[PDB]
Design an enzyme around this catalytic site. Structure first.
Site, PDB file in Angstrom:
ATOM      1  CG  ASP A 121     -22.017   3.069  12.062  1.00 42.21           C
ATOM      2  OD1 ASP A 121     -21.190   2.393  12.656  1.00 42.21           O
ATOM      3  OD2 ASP A 121     -21.976   4.290  12.095  1.00 42.21           O
ATOM      4  CB  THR A 159     -17.326   4.078  11.486  1.00 46.74           C
ATOM      5  OG1 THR A 159     -18.132   4.033  12.648  1.00 46.74           O
ATOM      6  CG2 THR A 159     -18.215   3.859  10.322  1.00 46.74           C
ATOM      7  CG  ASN A 180     -13.710   6.891  13.067  1.00 48.19           C
ATOM      8  OD1 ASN A 180     -13.631   6.209  12.020  1.00 48.19           O
ATOM      9  ND2 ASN A 180     -14.661   6.688  13.982  1.00 48.19           N
ATOM     10  CG  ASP A 261     -22.418   4.299  15.540  1.00 53.47           C
ATOM     11  OD1 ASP A 261     -21.571   3.690  16.175  1.00 53.47           O
ATOM     12  OD2 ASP A 261     -22.279   5.505  15.341  1.00 53.47           O
ATOM     13  CG  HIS A 309     -18.069  -0.668  15.084  1.00 53.83           C
ATOM     14  ND1 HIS A 309     -19.096  -0.156  15.859  1.00 53.83           N
ATOM     15  CD2 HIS A 309     -17.771   0.284  14.170  1.00 53.83           C
ATOM     16  CE1 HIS A 309     -19.422   1.044  15.404  1.00 53.83           C
ATOM     17  NE2 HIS A 309     -18.610   1.346  14.406  1.00 53.83           N
ATOM     18  CG  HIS A 420     -17.892   1.948  18.356  1.00 53.68           C
ATOM     19  ND1 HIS A 420     -17.017   2.286  17.344  1.00 53.68           N
ATOM     20  CD2 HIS A 420     -18.928   2.814  18.264  1.00 53.68           C
ATOM     21  CE1 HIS A 420     -17.513   3.301  16.655  1.00 53.68           C
ATOM     22  NE2 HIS A 420     -18.670   3.646  17.194  1.00 53.68           N
ATOM     23  CG  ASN A 683      10.459  -5.066   9.454  1.00 53.94           C
ATOM     24  OD1 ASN A 683       9.938  -6.082   9.946  1.00 53.94           O
ATOM     25  ND2 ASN A 683      10.684  -4.949   8.150  1.00 53.94           N
ATOM     26  CG  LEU A 687       5.101  -9.498   6.188  1.00 53.26           C
ATOM     27  CD1 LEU A 687       5.470  -8.744   4.897  1.00 53.26           C
ATOM     28  CD2 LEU A 687       4.138 -10.632   5.902  1.00 53.26           C
TER      29      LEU A 687
HETATM   30  C1  LIG Z   1      -1.632  -7.658   4.136  1.00 48.61           C
HETATM   31  O1  LIG Z   1      -1.763  -7.631   2.706  1.00 48.61           O
HETATM   32  C2  LIG Z   1      -0.995  -6.635   2.060  1.00 48.61           C
HETATM   33  C3  LIG Z   1      -1.249  -6.607   0.548  1.00 48.61           C
HETATM   34  O2  LIG Z   1      -0.774  -7.844  -0.007  1.00 48.61           O
HETATM   35  C4  LIG Z   1       0.506  -6.837   2.339  1.00 48.61           C
HETATM   36  O3  LIG Z   1       1.120  -5.611   1.988  1.00 48.61           O
HETATM   37  C5  LIG Z   1       2.093  -5.665   0.934  1.00 48.61           C
HETATM   38  O4  LIG Z   1       3.342  -6.026   1.483  1.00 48.61           O
HETATM   39  C6  LIG Z   1       4.515  -5.991   0.650  1.00 48.61           C
HETATM   40  C7  LIG Z   1       5.793  -6.118   1.526  1.00 48.61           C
HETATM   41  O5  LIG Z   1       5.738  -5.263   2.696  1.00 48.61           O
HETATM   42  C8  LIG Z   1       4.594  -4.709  -0.206  1.00 48.61           C
HETATM   43  O6  LIG Z   1       5.525  -4.906  -1.261  1.00 48.61           O
HETATM   44  C9  LIG Z   1       6.308  -3.699  -1.494  1.00 48.61           C
HETATM   45  O7  LIG Z   1       5.749  -2.920  -2.548  1.00 48.61           O
HETATM   46  C10 LIG Z   1       6.406  -1.689  -2.829  1.00 48.61           C
HETATM   47  C11 LIG Z   1       5.624  -0.898  -3.894  1.00 48.61           C
HETATM   48  O8  LIG Z   1       4.575  -0.320  -3.148  1.00 48.61           O
HETATM   49  C12 LIG Z   1       3.607   0.520  -3.840  1.00 48.61           C
HETATM   50  O9  LIG Z   1       2.787  -0.161  -4.799  1.00 48.61           O
HETATM   51  C13 LIG Z   1       1.719  -0.996  -4.310  1.00 48.61           C
HETATM   52  C14 LIG Z   1       0.977  -1.693  -5.476  1.00 48.61           C
HETATM   53  O10 LIG Z   1      -0.021  -0.929  -6.149  1.00 48.61           O
HETATM   54  C15 LIG Z   1       0.809  -0.218  -3.327  1.00 48.61           C
HETATM   55  O11 LIG Z   1      -0.226  -1.007  -2.768  1.00 48.61           O
HETATM   56  C16 LIG Z   1       1.629   0.393  -2.181  1.00 48.61           C
HETATM   57  O12 LIG Z   1       0.723   1.017  -1.263  1.00 48.61           O
HETATM   58  C17 LIG Z   1       1.272   1.327   0.049  1.00 48.61           C
HETATM   59  O13 LIG Z   1       1.837   2.632   0.114  1.00 48.61           O
HETATM   60  C18 LIG Z   1       0.913   3.662  -0.238  1.00 48.61           C
HETATM   61  C19 LIG Z   1       1.639   5.001  -0.285  1.00 48.61           C
HETATM   62  O14 LIG Z   1       2.698   4.959   0.645  1.00 48.61           O
HETATM   63  C20 LIG Z   1      -0.299   3.683   0.714  1.00 48.61           C
HETATM   64  O15 LIG Z   1      -1.339   4.470   0.177  1.00 48.61           O
HETATM   65  C21 LIG Z   1      -0.876   2.284   1.000  1.00 48.61           C
HETATM   66  O16 LIG Z   1      -1.736   2.390   2.128  1.00 48.61           O
HETATM   67  C22 LIG Z   1       0.222   1.209   1.181  1.00 48.61           C
HETATM   68  O17 LIG Z   1       0.834   1.415   2.456  1.00 48.61           O
HETATM   69  C23 LIG Z   1       1.215   0.230   3.212  1.00 48.61           C
HETATM   70  O18 LIG Z   1       2.326  -0.501   2.659  1.00 48.61           O
HETATM   71  C24 LIG Z   1       3.622   0.131   2.666  1.00 48.61           C
HETATM   72  C25 LIG Z   1       4.670  -0.745   1.942  1.00 48.61           C
HETATM   73  O19 LIG Z   1       4.448  -0.776   0.536  1.00 48.61           O
HETATM   74  C26 LIG Z   1       4.004   0.517   4.116  1.00 48.61           C
HETATM   75  O20 LIG Z   1       5.237   1.214   4.158  1.00 48.61           O
HETATM   76  C27 LIG Z   1       2.864   1.328   4.785  1.00 48.61           C
HETATM   77  O21 LIG Z   1       3.106   1.525   6.151  1.00 48.61           O
HETATM   78  C28 LIG Z   1       1.486   0.650   4.675  1.00 48.61           C
HETATM   79  O22 LIG Z   1       1.408  -0.428   5.609  1.00 48.61           O
HETATM   80  C29 LIG Z   1       2.772   1.271  -2.758  1.00 48.61           C
HETATM   81  O23 LIG Z   1       2.298   2.543  -3.187  1.00 48.61           O
HETATM   82  C30 LIG Z   1       7.885  -1.916  -3.185  1.00 48.61           C
HETATM   83  O24 LIG Z   1       8.485  -0.645  -3.187  1.00 48.61           O
HETATM   84  C31 LIG Z   1       8.639  -2.854  -2.206  1.00 48.61           C
HETATM   85  O25 LIG Z   1       9.900  -3.258  -2.773  1.00 48.61           O
HETATM   86  C32 LIG Z   1      11.089  -3.286  -1.905  1.00 48.61           C
HETATM   87  O26 LIG Z   1      11.349  -4.550  -1.285  1.00 48.61           O
HETATM   88  C33 LIG Z   1      11.599  -5.592  -2.236  1.00 48.61           C
HETATM   89  C34 LIG Z   1      11.491  -6.992  -1.622  1.00 48.61           C
HETATM   90  O27 LIG Z   1      11.128  -7.913  -2.629  1.00 48.61           O
HETATM   91  C35 LIG Z   1      12.952  -5.388  -2.931  1.00 48.61           C
HETATM   92  O28 LIG Z   1      13.019  -6.211  -4.082  1.00 48.61           O
HETATM   93  C36 LIG Z   1      13.218  -3.931  -3.344  1.00 48.61           C
HETATM   94  O29 LIG Z   1      14.591  -3.695  -3.101  1.00 48.61           O
HETATM   95  C37 LIG Z   1      12.379  -2.826  -2.646  1.00 48.61           C
HETATM   96  O30 LIG Z   1      13.263  -2.184  -1.747  1.00 48.61           O
HETATM   97  C38 LIG Z   1      13.449  -0.781  -2.065  1.00 48.61           C
HETATM   98  O31 LIG Z   1      12.754   0.033  -1.131  1.00 48.61           O
HETATM   99  C39 LIG Z   1      13.172  -0.141   0.225  1.00 48.61           C
HETATM  100  C40 LIG Z   1      12.238   0.638   1.155  1.00 48.61           C
HETATM  101  O32 LIG Z   1      12.132   1.986   0.735  1.00 48.61           O
HETATM  102  C41 LIG Z   1      14.664   0.233   0.374  1.00 48.61           C
HETATM  103  O33 LIG Z   1      15.147  -0.060   1.667  1.00 48.61           O
HETATM  104  C42 LIG Z   1      15.525  -0.525  -0.652  1.00 48.61           C
HETATM  105  O34 LIG Z   1      16.901  -0.185  -0.504  1.00 48.61           O
HETATM  106  C43 LIG Z   1      14.943  -0.390  -2.085  1.00 48.61           C
HETATM  107  O35 LIG Z   1      15.089   0.913  -2.642  1.00 48.61           O
HETATM  108  C44 LIG Z   1       7.763  -4.072  -1.812  1.00 48.61           C
HETATM  109  O36 LIG Z   1       7.726  -5.047  -2.836  1.00 48.61           O
HETATM  110  C45 LIG Z   1       3.226  -4.268  -0.764  1.00 48.61           C
HETATM  111  O37 LIG Z   1       3.286  -2.974  -1.346  1.00 48.61           O
HETATM  112  C46 LIG Z   1       2.161  -4.260   0.331  1.00 48.61           C
HETATM  113  N1  LIG Z   1       0.854  -3.825  -0.171  1.00 48.61           N
HETATM  114  C47 LIG Z   1      -0.022  -3.083   0.510  1.00 48.61           C
HETATM  115  C48 LIG Z   1      -1.356  -2.726  -0.146  1.00 48.61           C
HETATM  116  O38 LIG Z   1       0.209  -2.693   1.656  1.00 48.61           O
HETATM  117  C49 LIG Z   1       0.757  -7.055   3.813  1.00 48.61           C
HETATM  118  O39 LIG Z   1       2.110  -7.469   3.962  1.00 48.61           O
HETATM  119  C50 LIG Z   1      -0.216  -8.091   4.438  1.00 48.61           C
HETATM  120  N2  LIG Z   1       0.025  -8.181   5.873  1.00 48.61           N
HETATM  121  C51 LIG Z   1       0.335  -9.338   6.491  1.00 48.61           C
HETATM  122  C52 LIG Z   1       0.611  -9.271   7.970  1.00 48.61           C
HETATM  123  O40 LIG Z   1       0.443 -10.435   5.893  1.00 48.61           O
HETATM  124 CA   LIG Z   2     -19.421   2.566  12.803  1.00 46.77          CA
HETATM  125 CA   LIG Z   3       9.459  -8.344   9.633  1.00 46.39          CA
HETATM  126 ZN   LIG Z   4     -20.084   5.013  16.527  1.00 48.02          ZN
END
Ligand SMILES: *[C@@H]1O[C@H](CO)[C@@H](O[C@@H]2O[C@H](CO)[C@@H](O[C@@H]3O[C@H](CO[C@H]4O[C@H](CO)[C@@H](O)[C@H](O[C@H]5O[C@H](CO)[C@@H](O)[C@H](O)[C@@H]5O[C@H]5O[C@H](CO)[C@@H](O)[C@H](O)[C@@H]5O)[C@@H]4O)[C@@H](O)[C@H](O[C@H]4O[C@H](CO)[C@@H](O)[C@H](O)[C@@H]4O[C@H]4O[C@H](CO)[C@@H](O)[C@H](O)[C@@H]4O)[C@@H]3O)[C@H](O)[C@H]2NC(C)=O)[C@H](O)[C@H]1NC(C)=O
Ligand SMILES: [Ca+2]
Ligand SMILES: [Ca+2]
Ligand SMILES: [Zn+2]
Ligand SMILES: Cc1cc(OCc2n[nH]c3c2CN(C(=O)OC(C)(C)C)CC3)c(C(C)(C)C)cc1Cl
Ligand code: NA
Ligand code: NA
Length: 803
Positions: A121, A159, A180, A261, A309, A420, A683, A687
């Site tokens: 750390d 961290t 944190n 740290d 970090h 940090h 949004n 992406l």
């Molecule tokens: C970095 O890498 C990551 C990982 O690859 C990339 O993130 C992925 O991006 C995808 C697109 O944004 C996203 O795909 C969606 O998945 C939805 C199902 O999600 C659940 O299941 C997965 C799988 O196990 C899980 O990981 C998810 O976890 C998220 O949410 C939980 C609880 O909320 C959190 O604990 C967790 O931290 C994580 O949060 C993050 O992601 C969500 C988005 O999922 C954000 O909102 C958060 O802020 C946070 O950043 C989930 O539990 C699925 O529902 C989506 O499907 C919609 O869109 C498709 C398009 O193909 C469409 O077919 C459907 O119509 C559907 O739309 C419906 O819902 C809409 C919204 O409510 C609504 O408007 C419509 O009318 C429909 O009803 C979608 O496929 C994927 O889940 C995440 N994965 C992760 C881990 O984040 C990321 O993009 C990369 N970043 C870069 C810059 O490249």
């Molecule tokens: Ca640390």
């Molecule tokens: Ca976008």
């Molecule tokens: Zn520290």
């Protein structure tokens, strides 16, 4: 409630966690108040310390002792780590010459080399050099294995966000651990360093390495250690687990140290008090390596020495107070310190206005040491916006400073000298990476890289398929001797049209005007429109479009473009500017010239009337007229197909980049290839937006307004070769500039562009990979270089920090 009167007899540091209210004996039991009554006595033995001495050699086993020196200890797997040295005339690992580990040398029954992650750390990158005299074990790992001069953490450089990024390969915005401290307004719950809410699984998103391992049949040791377990006991527990029978033995392990740290906060990153914590961490490494050597595992295990970090000099007197800026300071909640996050104190307050808070925080004092941003305006390289736990208002704090709400918060909280959390490109925030083992290369330096990449590599090291993450799998192949992951280029989804001349001038009614007016050279202009100069301007092949869309390739003397019929503008524009190129101006008669493109229908074109009518919006060009190769070629730059919407404030930035900076870079880099284009991310998810996500259009038209403009600027790494005749590796820098209607972000913007534009562009430096996510394009498809090398190039970030 835990009925804490079962027993840890035989179960000390058991790997499966037992279910309440039966009592626990795992390294998490302390923080849950759930350890069995005899956990300290049985599991946290300390008698006689951690080292063998001459008189303990061959002793009768005493089960009271912390570790053992009796003849039976190796078969028990519980000797003190220095046992063979003291009692059997063996050398310490650090005193052995290093010898290449060409193949794993593992005991029978080992299915794969184990992975040990040794995390430290607050271990700032420069400690590797600056502390090397007092860290001989670490120095041997570093010089003999594979090392980077530093590894870039994620933002915020705190961290929990960084350790969980290490475990998941995800940006904090995606894994959910965005600081944190956090408020989640859907849960209406708060996450704090102190307390119990933070163990609730709903905070922790993605899929961490221990879960990826378990799902795929690879057993894992625990990654969390309770703070009260001494380091020597953590190491001994790992060494004991490594002596389990094959069917029970984990393959992946983590050690964690709270140092340096803890001391760095008190004494500053280079306080004289920092030497001892560094010696002590080196001693712990020495204990692990001596322990591995005893077990005949020191040429079998892959070890990763990795920090979360760095640490900067920060004291109480370098604090800015929001009470010096805001009238309404009591109606806000601030998350304070090395970053700021602001939200309303009460959701019942409908006189709370983010707009007025941002304005009261903007360029108010001559040396102000923080800058306010709506989160969607933060540099895209930070990837810090797409999470409801990240407040809309963010403050980027200058290195060496704090932000707080009111002075009383600071003296009713000078203690500390280090902290940090700052911008992850800051030199003092950089941390360390060393890999040592059969799967890593021997005596090899690799360029700096980001910690989001490590998950994929740890999955490779364990033969696991990584869960979807933000690394670019294959970009770190050059760290590895074997187990490389051989990625393939993604398939192009949309193929382009190649339109010829299909429209007469009079078919267009765009409200545009231009003052525009020999058989030998007529064939010449025709050849240019068919692609005769394309190998000059499109050096690495055309970008591939990885989604379904309708687009045209357009060729010109000086530039090539991929023109989107859907967004009415290029997705990309490519051009090469040699060292010798000359800058010219826009001639007087051509100042307001926009020309219909007879290859592209009126229906798929922008129009000038829309810009006339939109009092806020003007336009710019992607290939700059200033760099035209000749007066006749200059007309091509004014085609309506080269035009993009630009606020007047943004044109100040763009015009200076195109007129001054491109030529400067070509001079400096011996020619550059430039790819420029729009980005739409309304949004703020990092992406490419689909067409139904666009929130703003040039008034009265279907011309969508970009949120950002990018450029990718490539040349030869060996700058003795011109960009267009490069035989080897490439060199790249890129940016993603926010398309804003004001220059409020730049406090010195009333000055000449030579005093502020390049500073803005540096802040908004980007990876090619960031641009790929934002555009659905795939660059560098046709080079002479290996694909893994190109992946590394696409993850490169030009940081503009000194040495
Ligand atoms: C970095 O890498 C990551 C990982 O690859 C990339 O993130 C992925 O991006 C995808 C697109 O944004 C996203 O795909 C969606 O998945 C939805 C199902 O999600 C659940 O299941 C997965 C799988 O196990 C899980 O990981 C998810 O976890 C998220 O949410 C939980 C609880 O909320 C959190 O604990 C967790 O931290 C994580 O949060 C993050 O992601 C969500 C988005 O999922 C954000 O909102 C958060 O802020 C946070 O950043 C989930 O539990 C699925 O529902 C989506 O499907 C919609 O869109 C498709 C398009 O193909 C469409 O077919 C459907 O119509 C559907 O739309 C419906 O819902 C809409 C919204 O409510 C609504 O408007 C419509 O009318 C429909 O009803 C979608 O496929 C994927 O889940 C995440 N994965 C992760 C881990 O984040 C990321 O993009 C990369 N970043 C870069 C810059 O490249
Ligand atoms: Ca640390
Ligand atoms: Ca976008
Ligand atoms: Zn520290
Ligand atoms: C190497 C590694 C270690 C680690 O936690 C270690 C750790 N033990 N105890 C503490 C910490 C962190 N802080 C509080 C006290 C984590 C976590 C589990 C944080 C996500 C991930 C990885 Cl990849
Ligand atoms: Na206008
Ligand atoms: Na300004």
């Amino acid at each position: 409630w835990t009925a804490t009167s079962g027993s840890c007899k035989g179960r000390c540091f058991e790997l499966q966690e037992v279910g309440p209210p039966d009592c626990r004996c795992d390294n998490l039991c302390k923080s849950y108040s759930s350890c069995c009554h005899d956990f300290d006595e049985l599991c946290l033995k300390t008698a006689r310390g951690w080292e063998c001495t001459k008189d303990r050699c061959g002793e009768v086993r005493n089960e009271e002792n912390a570790c053992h020196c009796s003849e039976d200890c190796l078969s028990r797997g519980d000797c003190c780590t220095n046992y063979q040295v003291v009692c059997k005339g063996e050398s310490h690992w650090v005193d052995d010459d290093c010898e290449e580990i060409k193949v794993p040398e593992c005991p029978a029954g080992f299915v794969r080399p184990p992975l040990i992650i040794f995390s430290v750390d607050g271990f700032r990158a420069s400690y590797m050099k600056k502390g090397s005299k007092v860290m001989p074990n670490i120095e041997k790992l570093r010089s003999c294995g594979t090392h980077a001069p530093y590894m870039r953490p994620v933002y915020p450089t705190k961290t929990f966000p960084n350790l969980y990024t290490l475990a998941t390969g995800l940006y904090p915005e995606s894994h959910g651990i965005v600081g944190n401290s956090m408020y989640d307004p859907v849960f209406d719950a708060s996450f704090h360093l102190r307390g119990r809410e933070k163990f609730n699984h709903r905070w922790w998103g993605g899929q961490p390495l221990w879960i990826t391992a378990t799902k795929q049949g690879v057993r894992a040791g625990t990654f969390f250690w309770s703070v009260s377990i001494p380091h020597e006991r953590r190491i001994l527990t790992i060494l004991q687990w490594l002596s389990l029978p094959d069917n029970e033995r984990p393959s992946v392990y983590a050690f964690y140290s709270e140092q340096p740290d803890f001391s760095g906060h008190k004494y500053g990153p280079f306080g004289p008090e920092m030497t001892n914590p560094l010696r002590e961490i080196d001693k712990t490494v020495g204990q692990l390596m001596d322990g591995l050597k005893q077990l005949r595992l020191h040429r079998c295990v892959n070890v990763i020495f990795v920090g979360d970090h760095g640490m900067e000099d920060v004291t109480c007197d370098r604090t800015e107070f929001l009470s010096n800026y805001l009238t309404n300071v009591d109606d806000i909640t601030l998350v304070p310190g090395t970053l700021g996050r602001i939200r309303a104190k009460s959701i019942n307050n409908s006189k709370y206005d983010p707009k007025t808070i941002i304005a009261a925080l903007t360029c108010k004092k001559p040396d102000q040491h923080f800058k306010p941003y709506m989160k969607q305006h933060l540099p895209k390289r930070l990837h810090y916006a797409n999470n409801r736990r990240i407040e809309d208002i963010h403050l980027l704090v200058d290195r060496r400073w704090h932000v707080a709400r009111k002075p009383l918060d600071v003296y009713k909280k000078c203690f500390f000298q280090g902290d940090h959390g700052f911008d992850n490109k800051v030199n003092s925030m950089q941390t360390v990476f060393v890999g040592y083992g059969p799967t890593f290369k021997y005596r090899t330096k690799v360029p700096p890289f980001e910690n989001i990449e490590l998950y994929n590599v740890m999955c490779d090291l364990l033969g696991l398929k990584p869960a979807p993450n933000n690394g670019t799998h294959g970009s770190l192949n050059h760290l590895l001797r074997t187990n490389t992951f051989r990625p393939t280029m993604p398939d192009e989804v949309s193929r382009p049209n190649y339109p010829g001349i299909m429209y007469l001038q009079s078919e267009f009614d765009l409200g545009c005007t231009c003052d525009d007016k020999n058989k030998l050279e007529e064939l010449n202009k025709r050849l240019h429109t068919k692609g005769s100069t394309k190998e000059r301007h499109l050096l690495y092949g055309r970008p591939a479009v990885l989604y379904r869309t309708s687009y045209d390739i357009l060729y010109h003397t000086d530039f090539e473009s991929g023109y989107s019929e859907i967004f009415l503008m290029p997705l990309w524009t490519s051009y090469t500017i040699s060292k010798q190129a000359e800058v010219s101006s826009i001639p007087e008669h051509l100042t307001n010239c926009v020309r219909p493109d007879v290859r592209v229908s009126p229906g798929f074109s922008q129009n000038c009337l829309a810009y006339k009518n939109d009092k806020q919006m003007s336009y710019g060009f992607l290939f700059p007229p200033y760099l035209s190769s000749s007066p006749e070629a200059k007309y091509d730059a004014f085609l309506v197909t080269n035009m993009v919407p630009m606020y007047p404030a943004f044109k100040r930035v763009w015009a200076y980049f195109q007129r001054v900076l491109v030529k400067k870079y070509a001079s400096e880099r011996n020619g550059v290839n430039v790819i420029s284009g729009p980005i739409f991310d309304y949004n703020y998810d990092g992406l490419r937006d689909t067409e139904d996500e666009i929130k703003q259009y040039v008034e009265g038209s279907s011309i969508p307004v970009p949120t950002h403009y990018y450029s990718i600027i490539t040349s030869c790494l060996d700058f003795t070769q011109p960009a267009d005749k490069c035989d080897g590796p490439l060199s790249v820098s890129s940016f993603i500039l926010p398309h804003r209607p004001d220059n409020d972000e730049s406090c010195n913007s009333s000055e000449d562009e030579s005093k502020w534009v390049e500073e803005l562009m540096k802040m908004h430096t980007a990876r090619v990979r960031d641009i790929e996510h934002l555009t659905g394009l795939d660059f560098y498809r046709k080079t002479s270089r290996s694909y893994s090398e190109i992946l590394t190039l696409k993850t490169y970030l030009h940081t503009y920090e000194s040495e």
